[PDB]
Structures are given as structure tokens and as C-alpha cells.
Design an enzyme around this catalytic site. Sequence first.
Site, PDB file in Angstrom:
ATOM      1  N   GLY A 109      -6.408 -15.148  14.599  1.00 24.98           N
ATOM      2  CA  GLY A 109      -5.290 -15.917  15.060  1.00 24.98           C
ATOM      3  C   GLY A 109      -5.490 -16.122  16.563  1.00 24.98           C
ATOM      4  O   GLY A 109      -4.519 -16.010  17.348  1.00 24.98           O
TER       5      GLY A 109
ATOM      6  N   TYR B 260       2.145 -23.598  21.673  1.00 29.89           N
ATOM      7  CA  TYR B 260       1.014 -24.465  21.751  1.00 29.89           C
ATOM      8  C   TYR B 260       1.522 -25.930  22.162  1.00 29.89           C
ATOM      9  O   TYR B 260       0.576 -26.832  22.641  1.00 29.89           O
ATOM     10  CB  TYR B 260       0.378 -24.571  20.222  1.00 29.89           C
ATOM     11  CG  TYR B 260      -0.060 -23.410  19.796  1.00 29.89           C
ATOM     12  CD1 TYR B 260      -1.093 -22.631  20.333  1.00 29.89           C
ATOM     13  CD2 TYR B 260       1.043 -22.566  19.057  1.00 29.89           C
ATOM     14  CE1 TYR B 260      -1.400 -21.370  19.846  1.00 29.89           C
ATOM     15  CE2 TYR B 260       0.644 -21.467  18.743  1.00 29.89           C
ATOM     16  CZ  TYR B 260      -0.392 -20.645  19.132  1.00 29.89           C
ATOM     17  OH  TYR B 260      -0.889 -19.623  18.890  1.00 29.89           O
TER      18      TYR B 260
ATOM     19  N   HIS C 278      -2.045 -10.087  16.641  1.00 31.63           N
ATOM     20  CA  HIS C 278      -2.707 -10.479  15.615  1.00 31.63           C
ATOM     21  C   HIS C 278      -4.068  -9.438  15.523  1.00 31.63           C
ATOM     22  O   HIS C 278      -4.722  -9.344  14.428  1.00 31.63           O
ATOM     23  CB  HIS C 278      -3.113 -11.824  15.007  1.00 31.63           C
ATOM     24  CG  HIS C 278      -1.995 -12.675  14.733  1.00 31.63           C
ATOM     25  ND1 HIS C 278      -1.056 -12.263  13.804  1.00 31.63           N
ATOM     26  CD2 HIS C 278      -1.492 -13.776  15.166  1.00 31.63           C
ATOM     27  CE1 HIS C 278      -0.237 -13.421  13.815  1.00 31.63           C
ATOM     28  NE2 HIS C 278      -0.292 -14.014  14.544  1.00 31.63           N
TER      29      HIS C 278
ATOM     30  N   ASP D 110       6.301 -20.393  19.801  1.00 33.26           N
ATOM     31  CA  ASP D 110       6.086 -21.351  18.719  1.00 33.26           C
ATOM     32  C   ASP D 110       7.351 -21.770  17.805  1.00 33.26           C
ATOM     33  O   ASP D 110       6.966 -22.458  16.772  1.00 33.26           O
ATOM     34  CB  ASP D 110       4.772 -21.186  17.862  1.00 33.26           C
ATOM     35  CG  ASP D 110       4.467 -19.554  17.773  1.00 33.26           C
ATOM     36  OD1 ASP D 110       5.365 -18.575  18.140  1.00 33.26           O
ATOM     37  OD2 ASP D 110       3.365 -19.097  17.319  1.00 33.26           O
TER      38      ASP D 110
ATOM     39  N   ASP E   5     -11.669 -19.365  13.648  1.00 37.08           N
ATOM     40  CA  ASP E   5     -10.646 -19.751  14.651  1.00 37.08           C
ATOM     41  C   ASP E   5     -10.543 -18.366  15.660  1.00 37.08           C
ATOM     42  O   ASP E   5      -9.758 -18.403  16.618  1.00 37.08           O
ATOM     43  CB  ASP E   5      -9.015 -19.275  13.853  1.00 37.08           C
ATOM     44  CG  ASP E   5      -8.993 -20.761  13.132  1.00 37.08           C
ATOM     45  OD1 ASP E   5      -9.392 -21.803  13.746  1.00 37.08           O
ATOM     46  OD2 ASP E   5      -7.761 -20.911  12.551  1.00 37.08           O
TER      47      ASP E   5
ATOM     48  N   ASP F 254       7.772 -14.077  17.702  1.00 32.49           N
ATOM     49  CA  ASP F 254       7.029 -15.271  17.341  1.00 32.49           C
ATOM     50  C   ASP F 254       7.249 -15.880  15.953  1.00 32.49           C
ATOM     51  O   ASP F 254       7.747 -15.355  15.063  1.00 32.49           O
ATOM     52  CB  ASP F 254       5.339 -14.549  17.558  1.00 32.49           C
ATOM     53  CG  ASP F 254       4.244 -15.670  17.623  1.00 32.49           C
ATOM     54  OD1 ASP F 254       4.003 -16.313  16.472  1.00 32.49           O
ATOM     55  OD2 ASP F 254       3.844 -15.754  18.806  1.00 32.49           O
TER      56      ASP F 254
ATOM     57  N   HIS G 298       5.028 -16.327  13.694  1.00 32.97           N
ATOM     58  CA  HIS G 298       4.079 -15.572  12.913  1.00 32.97           C
ATOM     59  C   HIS G 298       4.383 -14.169  12.681  1.00 32.97           C
ATOM     60  O   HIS G 298       4.933 -13.621  13.818  1.00 32.97           O
ATOM     61  CB  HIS G 298       2.503 -15.718  13.343  1.00 32.97           C
ATOM     62  CG  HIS G 298       2.063 -17.352  13.650  1.00 32.97           C
ATOM     63  ND1 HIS G 298       2.365 -18.128  14.691  1.00 32.97           N
ATOM     64  CD2 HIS G 298       1.697 -18.285  12.393  1.00 32.97           C
ATOM     65  CE1 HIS G 298       1.847 -19.544  14.299  1.00 32.97           C
ATOM     66  NE2 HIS G 298       1.650 -19.297  13.067  1.00 32.97           N
TER      67      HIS G 298
HETATM   68  O1  LIG Z   1       0.930 -15.783  16.561  1.00 34.30           O
HETATM   69  N1  LIG Z   1       0.041 -16.379  16.303  1.00 34.30           N
HETATM   70  C1  LIG Z   1      -0.051 -17.887  16.441  1.00 34.30           C
HETATM   71  O2  LIG Z   1       0.299 -18.217  17.407  1.00 34.30           O
HETATM   72  C2  LIG Z   1      -1.145 -18.489  15.862  1.00 34.30           C
HETATM   73  C3  LIG Z   1      -2.204 -17.905  14.838  1.00 34.30           C
HETATM   74  C4  LIG Z   1      -3.014 -18.719  14.255  1.00 34.30           C
HETATM   75  C5  LIG Z   1      -2.720 -20.034  14.051  1.00 34.30           C
HETATM   76  C6  LIG Z   1      -2.049 -20.451  14.856  1.00 34.30           C
HETATM   77  N2  LIG Z   1      -1.780 -21.813  14.756  1.00 34.30           N
HETATM   78  C7  LIG Z   1      -2.469 -22.741  15.703  1.00 34.30           C
HETATM   79  O3  LIG Z   1      -2.941 -22.370  16.523  1.00 34.30           O
HETATM   80  C8  LIG Z   1      -1.921 -24.070  15.677  1.00 34.30           C
HETATM   81  C9  LIG Z   1      -2.063 -24.915  17.048  1.00 34.30           C
HETATM   82  C10 LIG Z   1      -1.641 -26.227  17.190  1.00 34.30           C
HETATM   83  C11 LIG Z   1      -1.112 -26.979  16.128  1.00 34.30           C
HETATM   84  C12 LIG Z   1      -0.952 -26.229  14.610  1.00 34.30           C
HETATM   85  C13 LIG Z   1      -1.282 -24.916  14.941  1.00 34.30           C
HETATM   86  C14 LIG Z   1      -1.018 -19.898  15.566  1.00 34.30           C
HETATM   87  K   LIG Z   2       7.280 -12.591  14.654  1.00 29.35           K
HETATM   88 ZN   LIG Z   3       2.528 -17.651  16.664  1.00 32.22          ZN
END
Ligand SMILES: O=NC(=O)c1cccc(NC(=O)c2ccccc2)c1
Ligand SMILES: [K+]
Ligand SMILES: [Zn+2]
Length: 398
Positions: free
Chosen positions: A149, A312, A141, A268, A99, A176, A178
Site C-alpha cells: 500500500g 489523495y 501497511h 482518505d 503498487d 485511516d 484503510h
Molecule cells: O492507508 N492506505 C492507503 O491509503 C492506500 C493503500 C493502498 C491503495 C490506496 N489507494 C490509492 O492509492 C488510491 C489513490 C487514488 C485514487 C484511488 C485510490 C490507498
Molecule cells: K483505520
Molecule cells: Zn488509507
Amino acid sequence: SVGIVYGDQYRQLCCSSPKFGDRYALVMDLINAYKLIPELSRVPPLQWDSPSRMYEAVTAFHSTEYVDALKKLQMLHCEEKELTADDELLMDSFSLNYDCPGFPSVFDYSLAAVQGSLAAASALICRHCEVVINWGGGWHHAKRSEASGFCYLNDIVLAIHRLVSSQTRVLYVDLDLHHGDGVEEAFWYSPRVVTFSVHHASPGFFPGTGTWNPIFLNGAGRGRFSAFNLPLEEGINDLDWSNAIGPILDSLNIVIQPSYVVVQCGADCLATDPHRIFRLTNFYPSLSGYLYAIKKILSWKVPTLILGGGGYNFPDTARLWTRVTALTIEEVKGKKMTISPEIPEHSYFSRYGPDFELDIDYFPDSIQKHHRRILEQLRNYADLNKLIYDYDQVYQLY
Ligand SMILES: O=NC(=O)c1cccc(NC(=O)c2ccccc2)c1
Ligand SMILES: [K+]
Ligand SMILES: [Zn+2]
Ligand SMILES: [K+]
């Protein structure tokens, strides 16, 4: 004034990644279409006098070998032939893979966000701006020697580092979906940067931290109790999310009295994000959790850095961040910003179909335990750091 980071090259670089495509361009063009740019002071991304000055800026947090590896990854992806096995192994040792892949501009792209957020921090320090916005930043991240990430360089840690070394305390607020693990970890031993992240946490959900560990870890050494977390269950709406974090935000401000606030505003959590985990909106009448938090934070009258992050669903991230931008101008300049419910005609108009409206297209006790836990932590923080606070005044907020 309210600053915002942009520039022609900046735009190109922020739009050159495979994961976030032209999102930054949608965001800045929606802001432009709503006539907000004349209200804003353009903050130019930082540039350096030499490769050595660039490196010492970036290696203020990241290791030299990691920066070398990232730069090599870019070069390698600007060539035809595949990586050697030795190169693959090198990239793997910094998680520059899966990723966090290489692409032809991966270093310039990553560095750009650092250039923007460092320039934003400097504009705050010299008091040219009261608030600065960087929608090309917010990559929380990335670690000292590891991509994670789709975050390659941690612009937030570097901006915060410039702010504290300008006694100075910084409050970092991470909205966020995450957990902001990279920023939290960076300042794990530092009491002068208080970090607070609200996020989804559940088994197997990225990145795994910011929740029960069983107890809650919260900093170490002199940084003990200085890292705050509020993990929330899926499905939460604007109102419950606001009520969950509002009292925490207010109490952190009262007790920490930060010299600067840095807010990561990853989009997100929107109901219409493909993650489909939280049910937040960009509604401004019910009321967007994002706009509630930002308004609350701006009401503190503390110099503030507002950053992007996740998000996203690009046109819906544009919708929210355009509203955050208008709200920031209104709260800081005291000048009303009326935004038409309809998307104005402009270059990216067709992306906002089929209805072309500014509102996103959506129809809408665990926490009480977390508040007691967080109140106790805030108390231990103040005790450890010999800070004077009205324990009652704080407790009444909840
Ligand atoms: O703050 N960190 C993020 O925004 C993050 C990190 C890793 C994976 C993801 N997930 C995705 O990239 C994603 C994209 C499209 C649909 C579902 C998940 C998000
Ligand atoms: K957060
Ligand atoms: Zn995120
Ligand atoms: K800390």
C-alpha cells in the site's frame, strides 16, 4: 509543548515520491500560512552515528534482507539500465513491485518517515513535548519483510516499539480509511500495545483484513483480545462515524490506561477524497469526525503521537491536517487558535481554487452489534490481563 516534525531535507525527501508528490509541502505551508509554526516546537528528524546504528534501528522491526532489498532497489533506480530477471525476482519476493514500485529515492523517502517518527517518540519520552505531530509519517501497511500500500517502512511500529521499551502500555488508534494491518500484525502477540482501527471493509477492498474472517480474530498468545477493529459501511458521515467510535475510544482509555497514545490520522475518509467512500469533513462549527476524535483523545492528557497516512486529495488533506494542528495547539496549550475561513495568501495558494476556503467543498444497528462485540472483547482483555475496571462505568458510555 506541541512538537511538529520538519526540516528542509525532510521536506525534500517527503516530497520525492511518485504517489504523494508535494503533499507534505502543501500541508506544512498551509500550517505556516496560518501562522501556526511559532506556536510549535520543531522536532528534528533522527539521524544516526553510522550505517550500523541505522540498520539496528530499522531492523528492530524489519528483517535485514528486506532492508537490504529496499536499499538495493533505490540504487538500481538511480541507474539507467533495467533490472535483471534475478533482481526482479528478488524485489517480487518482498512485494517491491506493482503498487510499491522503486523510484530514485525510495529508500531515503521511506527512512525519512522513520527518522521523523522515532524523533517524535523520543521527544515524548524525554517529556520535551506533550504531543508531537508528524505529517510525513503514518505508514501503517508495511510488514517485517514486505512493502504494501505504498508503505515501505513502518514508522509507526518502530515509534511504538521505542515507546513501549521506555509498566508501559501504548494505545494505537488508526483513523485511516484503510485497516491498519501492518501495525496490528506487528503487535498481534503483545498485550502492552492495544491496537484499534476504524475503517471501511468490503469484499475486494484493500487490504482485506480488520473484519469478519466466520469470526473476528483479535490477537494471539498473551496478546489475545488486544487487537480491536470497527469495519464500517460506505457512505458514513461525521456524526455517525463519531458516535460509532466515541464510546469505544473512551472505554479503551478507561480500561487500558495507556502511557502513550499513537494516532494515525489518514485523511482518505474525507468526502472529497478520490476513494469516495466515507463522508467525513474538516468542519469545525456538522463537526468533523477527525476533530471530534482528536479532541477526545487529547482530553485524556496522555502523551500523544499524531501521524499522517492516506489522503489523495492533497489540498483537502492540507485543510484537514492544518485544522488538526490548530486544534492540538488549542487543547494542549489552552490558547485559542482562530483560523480564518479563507485560505491565506502563500506559495501554494492557487492549489486551493476555485473558492480558496478552508472548509472542504462538500454538502452533507450493525454498529450496535459491533459495540456489544467490542465491549465483550474489552472485558476479555481486562480479564486476561488482570486489569481493574468498573464494568458499569464502561457499559454506561454506550
Ligand atoms: O492507508 N492506505 C492507503 O491509503 C492506500 C493503500 C493502498 C491503495 C490506496 N489507494 C490509492 O492509492 C488510491 C489513490 C487514488 C485514487 C484511488 C485510490 C490507498
Ligand atoms: K483505520
Ligand atoms: Zn488509507
Ligand atoms: K496487540
